[PDB]
């Protein structure tokens, strides 16, 4: 994806719930710095749902693509209240921006 | 299906492109199409809904339509690129594209709305709903439009996206934490949060006590207070697929009020 479009999409779709800076604060959602290729439910200080805590998924770019299209379908019981990114180009752009967060 | 006199495929892509450059335009386009239809009165048979009559005075200056010049000027550029589409059809299609673009349902688009020639066909003021009022006023307005309670609650669910502006309504902020996303989160927010008085806004509005970043109008919280509306709030908070289908049907009925012999447009 395009990192520039990915950052702007993240500002417009993720900023009310997630921070992207190194050591950024936990809010509605956890800090997502370094999340690409991490196991799910392990950001320090965040209290996850029962579904996300006990989940076995690893946030690789291909898994993030399915999740971001429909979070509640991919992980039933999740507390992430996100409508999803229906177009592949926008998902790819958002995923490319998450890959730059070390 | 029937092919319109405008290139609908290229038009649908140009609306998505315009929305990608400024995501806050999505909800604004939905509000524009809703207020162009909300002038209707099914008992008096007037108001000129779905005719783009809001382009003229006096309807453009009504208090309820403050701020709607932004989505109107954004779409004037597309009217120049596609002159065969009427302004009335363009506003409805732009709302349907924004709903689908933000993750909502795909509403089948019917074309053929005729534009208003001037402001002499406009309805009076006082037709648009007031955010400071509750269920008696909300039911009166939606009964005047020809909607039942199920459809009323599904339609107010569009507050899942967008925000209030002090300069347009005197209220402030978004209803959900995904203001540029379209799903049933208005209803889960309405039930799951503790809505407390916001002492920082002069016009009375509630805020979520968890973060204080969200808001609800008196007209939003009246859906919990009324026994009939509360049951539909509960239904949609529990089933997003049902919300998407019921919103699609009601929004299509809204944008086809006062229309005649429209044509089914092709998909995608
Ligand atoms: C609030 C309405 C959110 C928005 C908008 C976005 N996300 Fe989110 N996200 C949110 C929560 C509450 C949680 C925790 C969910 C749980 O069930 O416990 C998450 C989680 C994620 C994760 C997983 C993190 C992990 O396992 O440590 C990812 C990868 C994620 N969110 C991504 C993401 C993106 C890319 C978003 C915009 C495109 C986005 N989220 C928006 C809440 C919210
Ligand atoms: C009870 C009836 C309703 C009332 C009282 C009401 C009230 C309001 C108010 C006060 C605003 C803020 C406007 C501003 O400051 O910018 C608003 C915004 C909005 N409303 Fe409604 N509304 C009602 C029904 C609806 C319906 C039925 C829809 C759609 C189908 C809708 C869609 C929207 C959208 C999309 C916005 C946000 C626009 C933006 O972000 O720019 N509303 N509404
Ligand atoms: K939303
Ligand atoms: Mg009108």
- What distance in Å separates the CA atoms of residue B78 and residue A50, rounded to the nearest whole number? 47
Local structure of B196: helix, strand or coil: strand
- Write b or e for each residue in A21-59: b if 16 or more Cβ atoms lie within 10 A of its Cβ, otherwise e: eeeeeebebbbbbebbeeebbebeeeebeebbeebeeeb
Domain A1-102 class, CATH top level: mainly alpha
Query: Is B169 close to ligand 2, i.e. is its CB under 6 Å away?
Result: yes
CA atoms B18, B96, B156, B125: torsion sign: positive
- What distance in Å separates the CA atoms of residue A96 and residue A1, rounded to the nearest whole number? 5
Do B1-128+251-268 and B129-250 agree at the fold level?
no
Q: How far is B4 from chain A (nearest CA, A)?
A: 25
Q: Is A5 exposed, middle or buried (0-12, 13-18, 19+ CB in 10 A)?
A: middle
Alpha helices in A14-87 (DSSP H): 50-54, 61-69, 71-74
Counting one residue from A and one from B, how many pairs have CB atoms under 8 Å apart? 46
Domain range summary for chain B, segments of one domain joined by +:
1-128+251-268, 129-250
Solved how?
A: X-ray
Resolution (A): 1.8
Listed in order, strand segments (DSSP E) in B37-141 are 110-111
CB contact under 8 A, A17 and B178: yes
Domain range summary for chain A, segments of one domain joined by +:
1-102
Q: Is the distance from CB of B123 to CB of B30 less than 8 angstroms?
A: no
Multiple choice CATH, B129-250, 3.40.190.10, 1.10.420.10, 1.10.760.10, 1.10.10.10 = 1.10.420.10
Q: Is the distance from CB of B53 to CB of B59 less than 8 angstroms?
A: yes
- What distance in Å separates the CA atoms of residue B115 and residue B48, rounded to the nearest whole number? 10
- Output the CA angle B77-B23-A92, nearest 5 degrees: 115
Half-sphere exposure of B254 (CA within 13 A, CB side): 33
Contacts of B60 (CB under 8 A, 6+ apart): B54, B68, B69
A82 chain-B contacts, CB cut-off 8 A: 178, 181, 183
Number of the ligand 2 atom closest to the C-alpha atom of B168: 15
Query: How many Å separate Cα B48 from the centre of its chain?
Result: 17
CB contact under 8 A, A83 and B178: yes
- What distance in Å separates the CA atoms of residue A66 and residue A77, rounded to the nearest whole number? 16
Q: What residues are paired with B173 via a beta bridge?
A: B164
The helix or strand, by DSSP H or E, that contains position B215, with its residue range, turns out to be strand B215-216
**Domain with residues B1-128+251-268, CATH architecture:** Orthogonal Bundle (1.10)
Ligand 2 midpoint to CA A98 (Å): 33
- What distance in Å separates the CA atoms of residue B99 and residue B103, rounded to the nearest whole number? 7
């Amino acid at each position: 994806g395009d990192v520039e479009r990915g950052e702007k999409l993240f500002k417009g779709r993720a900023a009310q719930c997630h921070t992207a800076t190194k050591g950024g604060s936990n809010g509605v959602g956890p800090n997502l710095f370094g999340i690409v290729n991490r196991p799910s439910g392990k950001v320090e200080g965040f209290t996850y749902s029962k579904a996300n805590a006990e989940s076995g998924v690893i946030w690789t770019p291909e898994v993030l693509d399915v999740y971001l299209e429909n979070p509640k379908k991919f992980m039933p019981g999740t507390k992430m209240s996100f409508a999803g990114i229906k177009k592949p180009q926008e998902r790819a752009d958002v995923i490319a921006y998450l890959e730059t967060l070390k | 299906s029937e092919e319109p006199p405008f290139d609908i495929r290229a038009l649908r892509a140009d609306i998505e492109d315009m929305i990608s450059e400024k995501l806050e335009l999505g909800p604004s386009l939905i509000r524009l199409a809703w207020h162009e239809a909300a002038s209707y009165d099914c008992f008096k048979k007037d108001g000129s809904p779905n005719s783009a009559s809001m382009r003229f005075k006096p309807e453009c200056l009504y208090a309820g339509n403050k701020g709607l010049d932004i989505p109107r000027k954004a779409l004037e550029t597309l009217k120049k690129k596609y002159p065969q589409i009427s302004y009335a059809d363009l506003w409805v299609l732009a709302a349907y594209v924004a709903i689908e673009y933000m993750g909502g349902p795909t509403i089948p688009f019917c074309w053929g709305r005729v534009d208003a020639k001037d402001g002499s066909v406009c309805g009076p003021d006082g037709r648009l709903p007031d955010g400071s009022k509750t269920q008696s006023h909300v039911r009166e307005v939606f009964r005047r439009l020809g909607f039942n309670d199920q459809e009323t609650v599904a339609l107010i669910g569009a507050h899942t996206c967008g925000e209030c502006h002090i300069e347009f309504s005197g209220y402030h902020g978004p209803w959900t934490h995904d203001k540029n996303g379209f799903d049933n989160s208005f209803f889960t927010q309405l039930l799951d949060e503790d809505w407390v008085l916001n002492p920082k806004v002069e016009q009375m509005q509630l805020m979520d006590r968890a973060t204080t970043k969200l808001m609800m109008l008196p007209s939003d919280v009246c859906l919990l207070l009324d026994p009939s509306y509360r049951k539909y709030v509960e239904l949609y908070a529990k089933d997003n697929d049902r919300f998407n289908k019921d919103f699609a049907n009601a929004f299509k009925k809204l944008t086809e009020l006062g229309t005649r012999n429209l044509h089914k447009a092709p998909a995608s």
